């Protein structure tokens, strides 16, 4: 169906080391395809998917020089924000950046992202109109004024609606067998007695791709979150994902509960009941 | 592919 490309940047100031730490990763949907680590030996952009390996020497030189410029920029950004908030050099701080684009199932641009966090908190973000900036505080207003003067939004729009989408489609084709597949969840239910009057029903979803899935519990055909435990979707490590949902039910009432599995690779939504 | 313009904060 719909697809996305995302780049994730993490810069952490290291008070006990000679340099800050910078990590950059590229994702297409849920598959990571590139990485850069400022502490690694190579000092180059590195392949992390089989399908990116068909790109030539110019691509890797290009991505290397670009990510290194990102690295230097985000290194300076740490010092800039330290000054903005009047913080000392003794503490460790984190700058995070994400940008990328979404396409529909027709592979045409839907949404574009460009956003920052400082110490886990929203700093500045590009709005969906792709012309505007959400600046959280007075420090981010200083960043906003720099960018409006350089017409950053207009240049970003050119990337997110042009280069981002074009390269996404290129990757989607080169990794057709991996990125355009849809794996239906293998499902089962487990039962555990927690006490003499209570029992745990766990609804499993295994070996599915992509990561997007909805597991819901119902009691008498009626949505039940009031006692539902839901773990974060986790990677199996082989390119497929896993998730489970559990409810604590009264003993003898197991069959009153149903688990509902919603996934793309599933022709019809599955209903599961304990038997 | 990465963006080729590198704005600062």
């Amino acid at each position, epitope marked *: 169906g719909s697809h996305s490309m995302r780049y994730f940047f993490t810069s952490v100031s290291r008070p006990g080391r000679g340099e800050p730490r910078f990590i950059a990763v590229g994702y297409v949907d849920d598959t990571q395809f590139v990485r850069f680590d400022s502490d690694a030996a190579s000092q180059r952009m590195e392949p992390r998917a089989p399908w990116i390996e068909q790109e030539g020497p110019e691509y890797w030189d*290009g991505e290397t*020089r*670009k990510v*290194k*410029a990102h690295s*230097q*920029t985000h290194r300076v950004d740490l010092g800039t924000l330290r000054g903005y908030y009047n913080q000392s050099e003794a503490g460790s701080h984190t700058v995070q950046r994400m940008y990328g684009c979404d396409v529909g199932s027709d592979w045409r641009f839907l949404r574009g992202y460009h956003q920052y966090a400082y110490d886990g908190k929203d700093y500045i973000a590009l709005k969906e109109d792709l012309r505007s900036w959400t600046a959280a505080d007075m420090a981010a207003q200083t960043t906003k004024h720099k960018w409006e003067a*350089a*017409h950053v939004a*207009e*240049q970003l*729009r*050119a*990337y997110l*609606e*042009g*280069a981002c989408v*074009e*390269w996404l489609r290129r990757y989607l084709e080169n990794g057709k067998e991996t990125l355009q597949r849809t794996d239906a969840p293998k499902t089962h239910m487990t039962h555990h007695a927690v006490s003499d009057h209570e029992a745990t029903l766990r609804c499993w979803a295994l070996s599915f791709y992509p990561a997007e899935i909805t597991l819901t519990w119902q009691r008498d055909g009626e949505d039940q979150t009031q006692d539902t435990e839901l773990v974060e979707t986790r990677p199996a490590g082989d390119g497929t994902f896993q998730k489970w949902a559990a409810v604590v039910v009264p003993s003898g009432q197991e069959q009153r509960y149903t688990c509902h599995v919603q996934h793309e690779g599933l022709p019809k939504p599955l209903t599961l009941r304990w038997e | *592919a990465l*963006w*080729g*313009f*590198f*704005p*600062v904060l």
Partner: T-cell receptor, first 114, second 113 residues
Framework: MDSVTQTEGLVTLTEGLPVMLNCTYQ??????LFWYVQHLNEAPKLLLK?????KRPEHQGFHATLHKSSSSFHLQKSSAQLSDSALYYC?????????????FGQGTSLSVVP | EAAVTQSPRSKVAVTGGKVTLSCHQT?????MYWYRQDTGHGLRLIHY???????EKGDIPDGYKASRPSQENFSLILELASLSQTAVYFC???????????FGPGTRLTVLE
């Protein structure tokens, strides 16, 4: 594949008449163009930008409108003066999928005569 | 206020000789560039640099090397000068807004047999 074409050679013009220096381009992605100026025995400096919104202006007496449909960014001025005699560079800024660089044209020499 | 200086302003060289063109800038600009100009026309990028101790190839890097020993300094090196390298050479500098580039005065170089 990503290039700039400027008016060839020397453009001679009488003072008081309008300037018209042609610039066309080929751009893979959404274009951003700039005009640079070099006076005799001087460094090239930035004159104007293709930025907004809808097409129009920057710099001094000089203005340029971007027409993306026909890929035009011609340098214009209402009334040429003798001090306007200089070399003018139209430039294409490539920074979408590749590292930020300006791609300059050959430049058009303007000669304003009294 | 942003200013770029070049040295030397003029050089006469022999074919097969070594030429070093120097550039200095105290604008606190990370990005630096070398361009050549031919017979009062064209401005072609030879080498550029976004950080100290690293250099990148431009549009026409053959026969030229470049060195960035610090943020302030950017050298252009011709190891074996050729007649084709007769030109005016401009150094430039910018910050992240790399479409606003600030040029040096220029270096007239003529290579002779």
């Amino acid at each position: 594949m990503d290039s700039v074409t400027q008016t060839e050679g020397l453009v001679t013009l009488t003072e008081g008449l309008p300037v018209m220096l042609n610039c066309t381009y080929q751009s893979t992605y959404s274009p951003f163009l700039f005009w640079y100026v070099q006076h005799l025995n001087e460094a090239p400096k930035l004159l104007l930008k293709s930025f907004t919104d809808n097409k129009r202006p920057e710099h001094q007496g000089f203005h340029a409108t971007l027409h993306k449909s026909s890929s035009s960014f011609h340098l214009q001025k209402s009334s040429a003066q003798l001090s306007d005699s200089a070399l003018y560079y139209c430039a294409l800024f490539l920074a979408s999928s590749s590292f930020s660089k300006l791609v300059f044209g050959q430049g058009t020499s303007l000669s304003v005569v009294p | 206020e942003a200013a770029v200086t070049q040295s030397p302003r003029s050089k006469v060289a022999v074919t097969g000789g070594k030429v070093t063109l120097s550039c200095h800038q105290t604008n606190n600009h990370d990005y630096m560039y070398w361009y050549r100009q031919d017979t009062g026309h064209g401005l072609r990028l030879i080498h550029y640099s976004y950080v100290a101790d690293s250099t990148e190839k431009g549009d026409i890097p053959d026969g030229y090397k470049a060195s960035r020993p610090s943020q302030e300094n950017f050298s252009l090196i011709l190891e074996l000068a050729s007649l084709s390298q007769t030109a005016v050479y401009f150094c430039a500098s910018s910050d992240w807004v790399s479409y606003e580039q600030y040029f040096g005065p220029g270096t007239r170089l003529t290579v002779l047999e």
